[PDB]
Design a protein around this ligand. Structure first.
Ligand SMILES: N=C(N)c1cc(-c2ccccc2)c(CNC(=O)c2ccc3c(c2)CCO3)s1
Ligand SMILES: N=C(N)c1cc(-c2ccccc2)c(CNC(=O)c2ccc3c(c2)CCO3)s1
Ligand SMILES: N=C(N)c1cc(-c2ccccc2)c(CNC(=O)c2ccc3c(c2)CCO3)s1
Ligand SMILES: N=C(N)c1cc(-c2ccccc2)c(CNC(=O)c2ccc3c(c2)CCO3)s1
Ligand SMILES: N=C(N)c1cc(-c2ccccc2)c(CNC(=O)c2ccc3c(c2)CCO3)s1
Ligand SMILES: N=C(N)c1cc(-c2ccccc2)c(CNC(=O)c2ccc3c(c2)CCO3)s1
Ligand SMILES: [Cl-]
Ligand SMILES: [Cl-]
Ligand SMILES: [Mg+2]
Ligand SMILES: [Mg+2]
Ligand SMILES: [Mg+2]
Ligand SMILES: [Mg+2]
Lengths: 229, 5, 229, 5
């Protein structure tokens, strides 16, 4: 680890600086170093990890889609080669994240809160691998994403209220997985709708801070439901 | 594209 | 050169793909490889080179400003260290570009068009070095930027019409150099104003395609003049 | 910040 000689606290601090500077690759490298210190991540630190890698892989996915569209229209080796290059880089980021989760964030997550957070991430990064996969490996990746998501759902329903923003974000993303990856649009609609309704019925228990948090994600659930119905 | 968080 | 084994045409093609994918680091690496083939760059290829590195160093400058602001407010070692890291990376991109210009784009530019283009770039990348420099090295960098810009101005005035977009962009940037780097705001105002007026008086000679090109940069000259007066 | 191209 190139970050192995830096203090954990300094790495968290610099991750927060990288975020202010919109330096998300740096941010992710800092949080990888923090994770590799072997101590558990706080809620804020989990958000820093998730934000950094979501931005990094987000840009790679956007690039991959542009190139894949160009590739499909043109169907020399260049378009394919360059798509493959971005694809390989994207798969390596996903492998890096899944490696952190597997060694050893998930097993050391002794709370429902932290374990759900990491299990959702695991489903997300398998989902991103699924988006670019193209064979019998695609089916294994799809099932691995579903299993991770579903385990997070089971825990979240036992241990978190229906307005918890991590529970809500989990359901939002699992729903998109069903729609876009699993060819299960009915499942996607049913999950987003049930999640939205159960959250709405719980808003009356929330302080003003929590209300803002939950309603932000409810908005995204409705946006997707409006696309799909 | 649909929203994810 | 990691790009040394790729065909020149393939590198240009992939630079254009990287641009569509907003992959500007890749774009710049591709155009560096193209430049290192040793053949001259076409007008389109010069634009591809300039766009790629402007985006890369643009993001570094934006990051450096954010961190420098944070540093100045806080005035542990972390803010300084991370600013220094971005700064060093920014200086390395500038050195890479100046190295391409010096070896051997400028000397092999046998046209006024191409030589002005490269001399403007040289002033820009010395300008970007000046923005982060902090000593007797700062003064040498400032004078080197001015000398590059002024040589480009001399050639451009002899060999290009006052509406040529490279002449216009040169003057725009040289003007900003005077205002922001050289503490010569009067010079900056006089150059932007004279450039704007002489271009306006030449618009009547332009086809509709050229008119759009020149008026786009005239807009930027006025925007700066509106800031400064 | 002023405009450059
Ligand atoms: N430095 C950051 N980025 C964050 C730091 C914290 C934090 C700070 C202190 C304590 C605990 C947590 C965050 C909490 N999470 C969100 O606010 C949030 C996350 C994702 C998301 C939305 C909102 C809306 C769209 O998707 S984020
Ligand atoms: N139990 C809860 N309800 C929460 C507890 C904490 C917390 C925990 C420890 C320390 C400080 C704060 C939360 C901080 N906020 C988030 O983590 C967050 C995450 C994703 C997200 C949003 C908010 C809004 C949209 O998407 S929320
Ligand atoms: N396939 C389904 N289950 C649905 C079928 C229908 C329906 C009825 C008549 C005609 C066609 C479709 C639905 C209507 N739409 C919603 O109820 C709805 C939309 C957005 C939204 C929420 C709810 C909650 C948060 O944001 S949903
Ligand atoms: N692939 C690209 N990006 C470009 C390709 C070409 C080109 C194509 C074929 C032949 C010759 C040149 C460009 C010409 N230059 C501009 O259009 C331009 C450049 C900078 C600028 C503005 C406009 C407005 C703000 O700053 S740009
Ligand atoms: N002699 C001229 N007037 C031009 C000649 C060519 C050209 C040359 C060879 C092949 C094809 C085209 C131009 C292409 N356009 C630009 O290079 C350009 C650059 C910067 C810029 C803008 C436009 C608009 C705003 O900023 S312009
Ligand atoms: N210091 C200077 N030389 C100037 C001094 C004054 C002035 C006069 C009275 C009061 C204060 C200032 C100026 C007025 N402003 C412009 O003429 C102007 C502004 C924007 C613009 C253009 C021209 C052309 C393209 O976009 S300019
Ligand atoms: Cl490639
Ligand atoms: Cl650092
Ligand atoms: Mg320590
Ligand atoms: Mg534990
Ligand atoms: Mg060849
Ligand atoms: Mg020559």
């Amino acid at each position: 680890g190139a970050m192995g000689s830096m203090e954990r606290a300094s790495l968290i601090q610099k991750a927060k600086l990288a975020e202010q500077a919109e330096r998300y690759e740096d941010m992710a490298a800092f949080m990888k170093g923090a994770v590799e210190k072997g101590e558990e991540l706080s809620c804020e630190e989990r958000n820093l990890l998730s934000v950094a890698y979501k931005n990094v892989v987000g840009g790679q996915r956007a690039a991959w889609r542009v190139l894949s569209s160009i590739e499909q229209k043109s169907n020399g080796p260049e378009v394919r080669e360059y798509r493959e290059k971005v694809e390989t880089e994207l798969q390596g980021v996903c492998d890096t994240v899944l490696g952190l989760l597997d060694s050893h964030l998930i097993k050391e997550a002794g709370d429902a809160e932290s374990r759900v957070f990491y299990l959702k991430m695991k489903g997300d990064y398998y989902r991103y691998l699924a988006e670019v996969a193209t064979g019998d490996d695609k089916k294994r990746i799809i099932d691995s994403a579903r299993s991770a998501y579903q385990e997070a759902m089971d825990i979240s329903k036992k241990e978190m209220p229906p307005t918890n923003p991590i529970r809500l974000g989990l359901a939002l993303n699992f729903s998109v997985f069903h729609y876009e990856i699993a060819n299960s649009p009915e499942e996607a609609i049913s999950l987003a709708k049930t999640t939205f309704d159960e959250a709405m019925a719980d808003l009356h228990t929330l302080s003003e801070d929590s209300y803002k948090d939950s309603t932000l994600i409810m908005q995204l659930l409705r946006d997707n439901l409006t696309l799909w119905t | 594209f649909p929203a994810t968080v």
